[PDB]
Amino acid sequence: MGYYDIDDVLADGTEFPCKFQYDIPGLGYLENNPGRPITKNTKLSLPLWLARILAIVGGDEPVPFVELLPPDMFSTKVMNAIKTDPVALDLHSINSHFFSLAIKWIMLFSEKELANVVSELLLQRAQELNHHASSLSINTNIATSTFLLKLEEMEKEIYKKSHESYKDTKRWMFK
Amino acid sequence: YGDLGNKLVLEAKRTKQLYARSNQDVNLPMYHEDIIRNILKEVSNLRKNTEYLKEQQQLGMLDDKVAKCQYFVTLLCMERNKRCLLAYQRLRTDILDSMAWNNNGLDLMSSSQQDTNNLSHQEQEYLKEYCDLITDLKSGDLVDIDLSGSLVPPSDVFIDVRVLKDAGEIQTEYGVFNLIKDSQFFVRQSDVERLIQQGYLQKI
Amino acid sequence: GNVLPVKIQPPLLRPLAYRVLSRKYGLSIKSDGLSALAEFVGTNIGANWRQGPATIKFLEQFAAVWKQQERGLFIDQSGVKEVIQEMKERRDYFKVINASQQQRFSYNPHKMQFIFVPNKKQNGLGGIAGFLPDIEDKVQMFLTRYYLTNDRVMRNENFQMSITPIKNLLGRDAQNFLLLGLLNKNFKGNWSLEDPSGSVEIDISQTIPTQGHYYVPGCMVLVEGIYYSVGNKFHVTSMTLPPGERREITLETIGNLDLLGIHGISNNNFIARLDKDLKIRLHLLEKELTDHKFVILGANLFLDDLKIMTALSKILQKLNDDPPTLLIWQGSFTSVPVFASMSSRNISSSTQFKNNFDALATLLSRFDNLTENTTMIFIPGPNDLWGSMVSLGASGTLPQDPIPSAFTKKINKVCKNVVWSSNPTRIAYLSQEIVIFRDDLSGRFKRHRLEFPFQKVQETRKLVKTILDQGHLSPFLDSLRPISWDLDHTLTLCPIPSTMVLCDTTSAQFDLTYNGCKVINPGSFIHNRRARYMEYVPSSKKTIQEEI
Amino acid sequence: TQIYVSPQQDFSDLMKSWKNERCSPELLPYPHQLMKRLLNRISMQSQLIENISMGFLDMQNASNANPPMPNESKLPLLCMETELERLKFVIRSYIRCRLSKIDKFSLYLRQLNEDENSLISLTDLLSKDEIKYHDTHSLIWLKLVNDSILKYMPEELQAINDTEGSVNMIDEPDWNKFVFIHVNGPPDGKWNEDPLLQENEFGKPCYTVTIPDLKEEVELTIGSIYVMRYEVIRDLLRDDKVALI
Amino acid sequence: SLPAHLQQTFSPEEIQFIVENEPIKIFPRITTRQKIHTRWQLITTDDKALNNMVAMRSTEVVLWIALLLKQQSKCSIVAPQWLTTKELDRKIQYEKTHPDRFSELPWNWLVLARILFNKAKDDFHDPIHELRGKIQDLREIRQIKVLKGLKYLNESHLQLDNLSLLEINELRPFITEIMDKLREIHTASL
């Protein structure tokens, strides 16, 4: 949680499905005809940076104005996919802010069943990241590139840092 | 509504990658104050709208729940706009200070970017103030040690130096070096690092 | 050296100089710097090589003076000059400049910033022909003017409705719009508006213009109307010149750029700005300003007739007791244009022109206080030597050449401070910008007023409003007043001057002020058996006097 | 420190402090006395080398006489000057690292300083030049950001130290960051008089630390490198029990 | 210093410096015993050995002084007990016979080796290529053991009893970031 961090600011911008648990006249002006109010139980795709607050304010039965539905990224389908084989999964395709979004979602809703699986996922991916980082040139196969293009954005900085560390050590060793 | 702000923030990320790939402060790009003032005028619109809505809320014909939800939505919009703008500005200031710290605080316009026109006026006066602080810092208790010197540990005393640009002759302590074009020197390491940073010497 | 200088051995002083100039501040001491320091430690022999603080503080003052000039990595033969500066650091500061030496600055529409342009003389050879502008200059001159006007209009508070480029008017009809551009006559002979995008036609049958402006071809105008695709007529219903801006607001957009650089200048390598000494010089100008008065005379003081000479002699008789700071003579100095003489029997017109100024040198001999204490300024008139040679007294090129040296070989020797400049000339005071421009205005704007189908102090109000809102000295096309391709920037009113010396022989005297600037309207030097001239107090006050 | 056994002990302490500060995620206090001694040492050594060099130079330039014998003349002063350059490099790196650290956490330490209940005072952690650096830099940055953006902000949220709403904007140091340590043991040569160390099978004196989040106890023995979070290890580090790598 | 996050780890140059800041034994060629001359009188080293040396007698000086004298002809570096075949053989045997414990080897492993091989090529008793090959074998074996051990990464702590300097330096960022992310996940879950 850093105010001046670019990736967190970008990740706050993703849209999450949610429903109007409460009915408010005069709303929806910013999306549709302003004169027509929004009726109850209306599904919307609101950004995280406001959906996080509007679901906790209550306002007032001090129920919040909005009720947030389970997003499609966190689905039984994806859970099975990540559990069966994580090393070859193109998690980049599902979302490009997966890990920070997962942290925020698990922080909002404590769920012991996601922490362990996500931890195991990234732990298993770390070994292959190290494997590829150690390898250096001295004629190139498709496996390395097709792996590197599946990564999450937050793993790229670890990959680059490790690669630079190994390259610098090799350069110093051989002169 | 603040999606436009993301367009700014995303752009900033690219600039950081420009820093990352190069690993050297150089050629800082042109600012984006146009989108910034677009956000400023839209946030002025938001502020005047919020003030008006508070006016009608105090007037008595406006629903309390509507007033409060409008107020929260507008406040969140302002918060995100401010966050985006300061996120851009902090990175700009950081890279500016990084650039200013290593060139001995003299801005070196004679020989990075040439025009420095890609920086706002406020940024340029901030750069001048930071150069002032950089000059001030080494003038106090640490006068014997140049804080803007090298950072590579001294590993050897005598190195070969090959000339890169032509000049006349330059004095040193107990001697004088004539910078004839394209010659080689066998000199002490701790004498020519200043020239090397200036770009007048090559082949360390 | 000192009273007892001792010649040094350079090796032993080498460490003292090298340490200070290569470890704390500075870099790359040359041999010239070391020899200079040898001489100037000869000037500081007092207990030196055993006395630290004095030489060290002189060296740090040296550094504090040297490091503000460029980057100064090497010490060339200027070092003695900065040492003379050191000696001297232990009314001036005003400059007069002509349109020939004004710095060139382009304007870029894609970067919204002024760009320095190198002068052809400084970098080029200039020994054969360097004053000839290039072909694309006339292509880009109107582009530059339009870009500046567009920026000025769009900076307005009211406009944040938006105008539409001309070419984007093809696909719509029966809709109101707003647009601006050059106003002229098409090849066919109809009224048209031209824009970098394109051009359209104008319907005038029901136009209601904003009064107080001289709607003239060649002037930026704001047009509100309804397009009609049945023909190509943009039916106009309202029309007004764009509004103007004061000096400070236009300046702050570029902070305080060094356009008329006297303290410092910008060039290709770097851009410079300054506001610290502006308030100091303003405070300096606020005092003893009444002592530094400058007086101007009327227009067209012909030095051939006896009456003008007698009146001038009386003026100088009154003036010699109290010489002013600046004296300006404007208008032609000969009542007949000089040109080819087909007869050799009589005096050549060029020789007569030379003779007329010679008598003026003689008349200067009896007013020595004026010749000794007041500088002199001469501004060419419409039918002087170079112009009348091809213009024969009619209007010609505006960036007019100065008076030739060959015909002024005695005035320069009698007086001690005489400067000849172009017809548009700019002087730089401590905190004031003054421009002087001599030509005919009221007749020109009266004869070319646009016609609309449907107490003399109002005319000058209209003239001033038009010339200040347009922001260009010559709001006329190339048909009327041909302008040199590159020097057009001199006629631009970018950051408008503090005071304008607008002399028009066809207009009555006026002292109006508007939009942060004030304008003075001197008349002819003589009128109705009387002669007059005016003086302006730097405290924004004017006086008029008549001496017949 | 209170007194020096030898300047080499001072050098070792300086190097250990530099290593500790380089990897620490939190701004550590300021060892005034060490650099107080070291700057005087550097000045005196520089004066000596300059004096002897000037003596050689002026005896050489007053008359041709005899050039200095190449043996026992060049190499000693060469060693002095290269050692001085090395020490200057080390001190420069330390100072620049501290400057960057105080660059990062400026607002947090400022807001901590004004706290009356906070027993830690800004005077001890920083030198005077560092204090002026912090305050001037903070004012300059605040002026820049106020002119550029905050001038247009509404009255509600113009302050850049707000700690309410959604996101706080004060960057506390991460006390939980994992760091590499080396258990050096007690600085005493007895290395057995601490009231903290215990013993296990085959002797192996050890310290027992506890993690509250995991509710565990971790054993640390002498001569073993561990990877432990920074929070549980501040006291051992400040007592010179363990040295970071 | 920041210079692109150089404020978190050590560059190889700094490692080489901090290793050459260590004492070593020397076999001098010249004598500078005092007349019973210039005082060494350094500030970070006991000058007594420097002042009190005599030719063909063993004494201890810091590494970089020995290197500087080796650049001249006043030096003869004495290699440690590692740099010989019969010790490296028992070392590699120890690694082979114990597949879980890194062998006992100091922090300056392989760095003194690189420096001595680069500079003191001639003073050895053993051929250089044999020693270089055996050192390469040790490097490969320890690299394999490191990869084997890295499989399990607890979120609490870890023990790496016998890693040398460069081996820790190269691996620091990846390991640190992985455990930081794991700790963040666990703490957020509670």
XYZ file of C-alpha atoms in Angstrom, chain B residues 30-31 41 106-110 114-117 121 124 128 135 138-139 143 146 167-176 191 194-195 198 200, chain C residues 11 14-15 18-19 22-31 34 70-71 73-74 111-115 160 252-253 255 267-271 273:
70
model
C 8.271 16.729 -22.832
C 5.651 17.343 -20.152
C -10.936 22.493 -15.514
C 26.254 22.845 -12.374
C 23.507 21.777 -14.854
C 26.239 21.465 -17.531
C 24.439 23.248 -20.375
C 27.662 23.421 -22.410
C 20.653 20.302 -24.877
C 17.760 22.776 -24.652
C 16.108 21.663 -21.379
C 12.961 23.114 -22.970
C 9.282 26.643 -15.670
C 13.411 24.518 -13.917
C 17.996 25.629 -9.786
C 26.475 23.510 -3.870
C 29.640 20.410 0.372
C 30.598 23.928 1.515
C 34.749 20.655 2.404
C 33.706 16.079 -2.804
C 42.070 21.380 -26.164
C 45.167 23.337 -25.211
C 47.261 22.513 -22.151
C 45.879 22.039 -18.638
C 47.864 22.434 -15.430
C 47.830 19.926 -12.588
C 49.592 19.758 -9.239
C 53.376 19.813 -9.870
C 52.856 19.437 -13.632
C 50.850 20.328 -16.718
C 43.834 13.003 -11.449
C 37.037 14.799 -13.361
C 37.962 15.034 -17.044
C 33.346 15.635 -18.431
C 37.061 14.690 -22.614
C 55.815 25.559 -9.722
C 50.873 25.776 -8.698
C 49.468 23.788 -5.716
C 45.282 23.994 -8.470
C 43.690 22.939 -5.179
C 40.221 21.842 -9.166
C 38.926 20.342 -5.904
C 36.411 22.750 -4.356
C 35.105 24.688 -7.375
C 36.113 25.174 -10.987
C 38.092 22.900 -13.259
C 40.883 22.685 -15.845
C 43.127 25.615 -15.000
C 45.087 26.717 -18.066
C 48.507 28.359 -18.301
C 48.292 30.625 -13.743
C 28.766 30.365 -19.671
C 30.297 27.227 -18.146
C 35.835 25.200 -18.061
C 38.854 26.984 -19.584
C 5.139 22.927 -29.162
C 3.324 26.168 -28.187
C 6.666 27.824 -27.486
C 8.900 30.475 -29.006
C 12.048 29.102 -30.647
C -12.137 28.078 -23.190
C 4.228 35.148 -17.499
C 3.249 32.562 -20.125
C 7.894 33.720 -17.438
C 20.692 31.670 -28.301
C 20.688 28.256 -29.980
C 22.299 26.379 -27.090
C 20.255 27.671 -24.149
C 17.189 29.671 -23.142
C 15.045 34.223 -18.195
